[PDB]
Each structure stands twice: as C-alpha cells, then as structure tokens.
Design a protein around this nucleic acid. Sequence first.
RNA 1: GCGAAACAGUACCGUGAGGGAAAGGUGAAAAGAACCCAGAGAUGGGAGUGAAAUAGAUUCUGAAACCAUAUGCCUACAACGUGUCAGAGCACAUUAAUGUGUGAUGGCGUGCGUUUUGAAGUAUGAGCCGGCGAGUUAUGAUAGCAAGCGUUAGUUAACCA
RNA 2: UUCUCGCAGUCAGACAGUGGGGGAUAAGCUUCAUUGUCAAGAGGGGAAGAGCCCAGAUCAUUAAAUAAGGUCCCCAAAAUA
RNA 3: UUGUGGUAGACGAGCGUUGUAUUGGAGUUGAAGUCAAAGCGUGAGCAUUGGUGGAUCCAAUACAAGUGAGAAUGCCGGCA
Lengths: 49, 56, 158, 139, 114, 99, 144
Amino acid sequence: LNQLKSVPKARNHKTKTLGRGHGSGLGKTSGRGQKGQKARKSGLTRPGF
Amino acid sequence: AVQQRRSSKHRRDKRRSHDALTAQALSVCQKCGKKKLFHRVCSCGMYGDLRVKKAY
Amino acid sequence: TKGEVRGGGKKPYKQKHTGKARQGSTRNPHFVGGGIVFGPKPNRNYSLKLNKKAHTAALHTVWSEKLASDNTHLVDQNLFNKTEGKTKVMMQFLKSAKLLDKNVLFVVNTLNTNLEQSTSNIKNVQVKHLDKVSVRDLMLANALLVEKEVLKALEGKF
Amino acid sequence: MIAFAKQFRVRISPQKARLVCQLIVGKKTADAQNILSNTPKKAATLIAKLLNSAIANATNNHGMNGDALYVFECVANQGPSMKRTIPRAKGSSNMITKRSSNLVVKLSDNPNERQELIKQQKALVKKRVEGQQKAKMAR
Amino acid sequence: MRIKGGKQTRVRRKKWLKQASGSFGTRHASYKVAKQTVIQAAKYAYRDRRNKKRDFRSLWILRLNAALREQGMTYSVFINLLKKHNIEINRKVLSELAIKEPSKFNLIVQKVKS
Amino acid sequence: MHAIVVCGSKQYLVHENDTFFVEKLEAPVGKEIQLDKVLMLDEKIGAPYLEKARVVCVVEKHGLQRKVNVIKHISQKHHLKKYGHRQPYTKLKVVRFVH
Amino acid sequence: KTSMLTKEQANKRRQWYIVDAAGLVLGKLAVKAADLIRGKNKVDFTPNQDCGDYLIIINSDQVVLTGNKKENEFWYHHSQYIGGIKKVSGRDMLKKQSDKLVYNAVKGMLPDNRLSRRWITKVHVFKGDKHNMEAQKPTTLNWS
RNA sequence: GCGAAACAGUACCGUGAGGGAAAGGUGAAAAGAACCCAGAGAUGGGAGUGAAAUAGAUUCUGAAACCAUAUGCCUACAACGUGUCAGAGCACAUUAAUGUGUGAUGGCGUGCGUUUUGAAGUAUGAGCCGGCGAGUUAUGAUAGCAAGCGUUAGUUAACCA
RNA sequence: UUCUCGCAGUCAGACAGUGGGGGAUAAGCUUCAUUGUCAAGAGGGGAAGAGCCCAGAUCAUUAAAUAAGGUCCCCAAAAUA
RNA sequence: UUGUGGUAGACGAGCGUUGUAUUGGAGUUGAAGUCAAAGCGUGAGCAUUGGUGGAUCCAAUACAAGUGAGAAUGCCGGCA
C-alpha cells in the first residue's frame, strides 16, 4: 500500500445531511415530517416522560 | 392611486414612443452667416433685414 | 460564534407596524460580521485509540514487505566514521550509491554526531532513531540502509 | 476613423441626451451644428462644445476630409452618480441622486465602417474555428 | 477551513440558462423565471411527444378519407378489405404519401375492387 | 420502381438513390444488409411480405439524435427526477432493391 | 423510427366557384359549403395554409326554412350597450339581410382562428347575380 | 477576520447610561502624461514616456443584473402565464454536424414554493441580479458494518521517556 | 403480511356509490361500516370537473390493434333497414 | 421473470468544492479567473478553442470539512 493508492478493503456508510439538496430528500423535510413538535427546535420529551 | 403592476422595459418604450421631438423652423439670412431662426432675429443683430440690437 | 461577540442587546426596529421581519439582533449569523454557529473549536481531541499489539503487527507486516523490496542493504557505523559529517563526501557517497532517486532512511541505535551533521539540508532524505520511525515514515523512504544492531531489537519487538 | 472624445460624467438626465442626439442622429457636419446651436436645451450646448472639440481633434490629429463626417453612433452612458439626501415630512426622508451621463459621439466619413466591424467579427470566428480545427489534427 | 464557492454556482446557473433563449422579455436573462420556463417547456415537450403522434394519426386519417371520398366510399369500408380478403398490410401514412405521387394510388384503388 | 420497406414497425417508401435514417442496427458501416421484409415493389403484393422480395442497403453512418433532456415534475409536490438521452440511429441508402 | 412527413408548402390557388341558393336546408348545405371553402375534401389538406377556393352564392332569397323556425328561433344582437339587444326573426332577415345570416352561420362553423376570417373572405353571398366575377373564371355547381 | 489592515472606538446618532460601520491593490521605476491642438478651464485625443497607456490614477482582473447602438429576421385585425411541436418563408455559414439564426401560419398550452381534505387561483413570498446565508462538536448509551485480538482474552485510563 | 432488530410517519382526511344516525331523511352538511379515487397517480370520455366510467406513465418511436365512449361540422371517424 | 408513478418516510450509489499528505506533470513561446460558441456526457458535469488578462496550479489516491443556495415580510451593494 502506497499513498498513491492507499485504500482499505471497505469502510463507508450513508450520512444524513439534513439540509442539502433533494437527492435523498434531506432538505426542508429533514426526515422528521412537517409542521410537527419533534420537527421544532429540541423537539423531544424527557426520557421517562 | 399608486402603481399596482410594474411596467416592463417593453412597456417603458411603448409609453416613451411619443418621446420623439419635432424639429424647429429655419430661415435664410442674406447679410449674416449661419441659418437664423424663422420669425426670429439673427446673431448678427439683424432681423427683417433690420439691425436694432447691440452686441449679441 | 453569534453569542460570543459583543454589541447591542435591543431590537434595532420597533415590533409592530413594520414591513420586514421583526429582527434577530444587531449581531446575527445571517447578518454581516460573522457569527457562524459551526466550525473549528478547541474542544475536539483529534485523537483515536489503537491497540499496542495492533501497531506491532502492522509494523511487523510493513517490515516484512519492506525487507522484500531489495533496497534494504546493510550499513554499519564504520562508514558513518571516516567522515566529518560534511555534506561533500556525503554527497559523493549518496551519488555513488544511486540514492538521488531514493528517500532512503538510515536506521541507527546511537545516532552518531557525524551522520546527524550529514544529510541535514536534504529534504529528500531523512534520518532518526530505530524506535522513532512510523509506518508513513517507513514506506515513504522507498529504501532503507539497515544496521546490524537494530536486528536484535526488531526481532525482540517482532 | 472614429474622432471620438469622451466627456466623463457630466451631470444631466441621460434621457434628454439620448433625445437630443436622436434629433442629431444621421445628420452630417454641415446640418448638425447649426440646428444644435440655437435649440433651447443646455445639454445641446454641452454636446456642441464636445462636438466642436472632436472636430478640431479630427482635423488636427487625423487630418481627415472634415466635410463629409456624420454621427456614426450616439451613446448615453450612466456614470456613477452621487447620493444626496433631502428631508421629507413625518420622519421619512429619502435619498436623491443627480444622474450623471458619459457622453461621446463617433464621427464617420463614409457610408460604411459598420459592415467592416462585421468583417472583423467574421475574421475572429474564422481564426477561432481554424484554431479548433488545427487542434483536431493533433487529436 | 472556511470555503466560499462561486465559480461552480456561476457555471451551473449559466449552463441552466444556456438551453433556452430567444424569449419575449428579459426572462432569458435571469435565473428564477428562466428555470421555471425551462421546466414548463420540458413538461410541454413531454406531453407533445405523444400529442404529436396523436395529431399525426388524425392528419393521416383525414387525408386518406378525403382521398377515399374522391373514390366515393366511407373510410371504414376500405379497412375491412385489408385483412381477410385482398390482404394489405400497408399503413395509413404510406397510403397518403402514395397520393402526393399521383397515378400510383389508382393501382391500389383498382386493387381493392372485386 | 418503388419499395415499402419495414424496419421494426415503421414503413418507408424508397426508390433508386434514396438515403434515410432508421433505427440503430447491427452490421456496422460498410457492410451490406439484405432485408427480406419489404412489400409493394412494383404492382405485386404479398400478404405478410412480398414474395422473394430482397432489399439490399449499405450503411452510410451510425449517428445519435440530439440529447433530449426529459423531466418528471408535478408542481407543489417536490420531485424533479432528471434524465437525458441520445437516440442512436443509422443513416443508410438503398442500391438495387431487387424483386 | 419515424417516416419523414411530406406535405405541400408555398402553394396557393383558390378557384372561383358559383352556387345558386335554393329551397335546400340551410344547415346541411352550409356544412358542406364550409368544408369545401376550408378544403376538407382536398387530398392535400394543409392546416397552416388552407388552400381552399372562392365561392359565390346566387339568389339567397329562394331559401326556405322548415318547421316554425321562421317564427320560433330568433337571432339577437348586442353591440356594446345595455338595452342594445335587438332581436329579429328569420323572415325579417328575408326582408333585410338573408346573406348575413348565412355569413354568420358559416363563420360560426369555422373555428375562431386568424385564418378563418381569411377563409370566410373567400365567400361572396349575393341576393341576386349582378357582379363582375364572370371575368374571374368561376365554376358553377351544386351541393357545394 | 480582534467591533476597529485607514487618522477606529474614528465618522455619526442622542443632553446620557449606549450603539456603531463602510471604504487594500498604477507601474519594475511616476518615469503621473515635455509638446500640440479645441474649449474659460476642467477635459479629450494625439505626441511622448513606458515591454505594453482596452496598463493613464474611475487606477490588477472588470461577472450577472441594468442602460444604448447597430448585421440580419419578424411585427400596425390583434384575445395571449408569450412557450413547445410542426411549418413554409427569410439571412446564412459551423466544436462537419438529419449546419446555424428568425419565425406567416397551424396544433397544443390556467406560473414557481408554502401549507392545506384538496391551492390554476382574488391565501401568502418574491422588483431584479450577484455575494453571504442556518443538522457540527465534548462526553455518554444503543443498533449496524469491518478489522485486530482471543476464551483465566484484552484494552490500558490519568500519567512517565 | 410469520419472529427479532433499526427506522420514521400521521391521529385535521376529503368525496361518489352502498346501509344508515342526526338534521327537515334539505344541504359541496355532519357521524359511522363497504368498495373506489385524490392525496402519493399522469391518461381518454363526460364541454370546461381532485372524486364519476374506462385505466396505472422506464426512454425513443411523423407504426398497428384495442377499453369506456363516440362517427354533419366546429373536433377524429357511419352507414343501412 | 417481474419489471423502473411516487410525497411523508427508509435503503443504496454517486458527482462537485476547499485544504492537507505524499506519488507525476504543465507553465510569461501563456497557467488561473472571465465572457461566446453550431460538442461530450443516464445525472449532478466534462470539456475544446477564440479573444480580456498576465501567475501559479492541475491529473490520481486517501484524509478532515465553516462544502453544494430560488425561498425564511433571510443580510450587504448596485440596478430597475
């Protein structure tokens, strides 16, 4: 293995760019519905709650 | 009232079509030089073949 | 970022009877003057953990494939002697040994002052101690002139 | 040739300059200055001064015929104007700019030199296409 | 590492403005309306890519019907004499181009007779 | 003197020294191709095709139509799948179209 | 893939024709007249050119109307104003304007197009036969 | 980019606690244009300098938007989200290619997002152009992928050379 | 579509027919159970229609046979008794 | 063989950018940026040349991102 062709066998996975383009959605949709409480900032609840 | 829809450049030139200005009237002066203004005196002080005015 | 720059603390405009968005602030990331929330900060460690035996095995394998590169000829302190460390005789020695193309490493256990003086102004070549070389520093040399003494240490380290 | 002389940003409405040079468009040297002289516009005097200056330069620095020249092309170029402000009632003021015009008039001495620019463009595209074609030989 | 990229955005906008031009108005000089018109025209082309053959079929049928009314019968009568008896597999548009070359479809009309 | 030649499902009228564009085909340029599916040569008609009819053509070139850029998009629904395509075709001419 | 379409273009000829109006039913004669003017019978119909023919109508007064339509269906006309509604019957047209009725009916049969006006110009309806169109080499026929 | 690369906490606003910016690039050396002309002059172009003055101080480049001119085509009967496909005609000559540009006429043709049961809409956002412009990281857990190691395995933490 | 795991998503649906409740058995009305459609789905016919009938679009296709429906013309084709 | 309508939502595969790291190359006999063009691409793109212009980068592989812009009565400037 040399720096001109240094590659592992395989290591890569899909990433979530929630505000980039329309390819996998991942935009205004954000993969969390539309006009929902979860979609809001810190939209969540207490773990026990 | 105030403007509701903007006028485009095509609309602008359609409105400005009447911007062409008419020409003036000219007259020949037998004694002085350049073509004078019709029904007006000439720069050389003379008008109906008549000089009544001082230095132009 | 936005919260770490001083400035005003008021809405620059009245709330009602306006024709724009109310405001964020005078200091806003969407306004001129910086304030981007995300970027480099002195909180990231920029470090990762690896097993010791993993590194030993990696070094052993890269030495195995390095030993077969037929550029691993032996060296001894004798030729590092008979020289004052001046690049002149060093330049002649490297040129005679066709080392201009190579970035050859010189493994050494003692780091004699003459060799340290030599090769100090050649970015192509580099030299350090036996137990200071990394895999990147190993495979980038394209050649290495090995010493008799380091064989015992590398065999012990496997 | 051109016999042009740029004015470099006199403050006047560009529309009025365009109008007066329409009044002078197509006309030759003998029938342009006379009418331009006594028309009641100030921009008329402005363009007349520069037209006389350009005629003088053409006679001096080019030595052309000077008796068949006519306006080849009028322009009305909007130079960078200034930003002035006058207060307006009930605390809502406005910024008023004095429009500035860049004025120049080209003087041609023949019924041509417009198609010759097309010939220059044709030579430009011809050298472009032959350079592309000569590159294809190496391809 | 702060990055500002304008070259790629500029070439993208230029290439998306390049397809369409010759438009009434400065619409072919902006990005928003130009892109909207490009997409609308693409939809127009998608629909017309079938509407054109839809209209061509009608054109062929109209012209063959006119030619057959020169012969003196309805369009439907001649079709029924192409599969079982007097088998013809010639298509509609060719029976029309046989009209632009006269004295050739007369052979066909004399063939469809008894 | 004429010929109705069928390629795929498209019929074409041809005569002597006629050049035309048809679907992309095998047997690349320079090679003669003799299609037996041709009808209406000279006053003779067969039911599926004209009997013993042989039309021989020589290919002049293999070309591509202009790249149509087709879109699918419904307003206010956020889908803009894009695709472009160049249509392969063959420009070729007939020589004899013998009986 | 496709066969190159072959049509005719830059070709224009409109043969002058003459018909004599009679007791024939207005609608069924007028549809045929319209299709002949537009050229729906030509083997070389050209939509963007419409190489039709000129036609002249003689003695439109002889047309009769079936049923009670002479006193059942009446044509109105509103020009631009409230109260401008003026309605006349078919027999009133016999007294004043029968040609214009056929004119408007045919124009109605023609789709509203820029060329449709140019096609109806090719129709010359006359209550009589006094005109200088004999020098235009007309064509006398029936059931046009 | 410390707010502030400049005479910046300066200009400015307020009677004050305070707020608060923008505006670098001549040339290799001003060698910043002797001299000429027209204009009162500024100025303009010559000359002249300079490798070069579409490098002349508006000073590296000078994009889009916007404003005019002109090659050539079409347009004064004309009901259209202005374009698509045809389609003669007209002007022609290319990243050699069913070459390109315009389009008499025909056929077709209620925008782009928003959220709503459902938006062609008289629901809202947009005057335009260009630039900038908003899902990262620290520790922690879970699930998946891979590799190392290996069934009294391993990893080392903080730390030391 | 059976079991584990990751992972949202909505809890405001709408309409026509079918059996209905309210209403006044009036409503593009409301409240259910069935089918279907739109939303998330283009197409033809119904003149122009989210909803009906015929139907489910990979790309090209100046080819054909068809579904509902239709054949005086606009606007595509039919007549005979 | 089924085939490829698709939002919400889920999976897969990529392109493009900045800089770094070595591995090669280009260049004031004209690189980058710039505008036009009668090409190439399944897609985000790749170009080839003409002219503006005179100085730095580019091909391949990984690396880590303030990385991909029409919209938020988004910000600056100019122009309508």
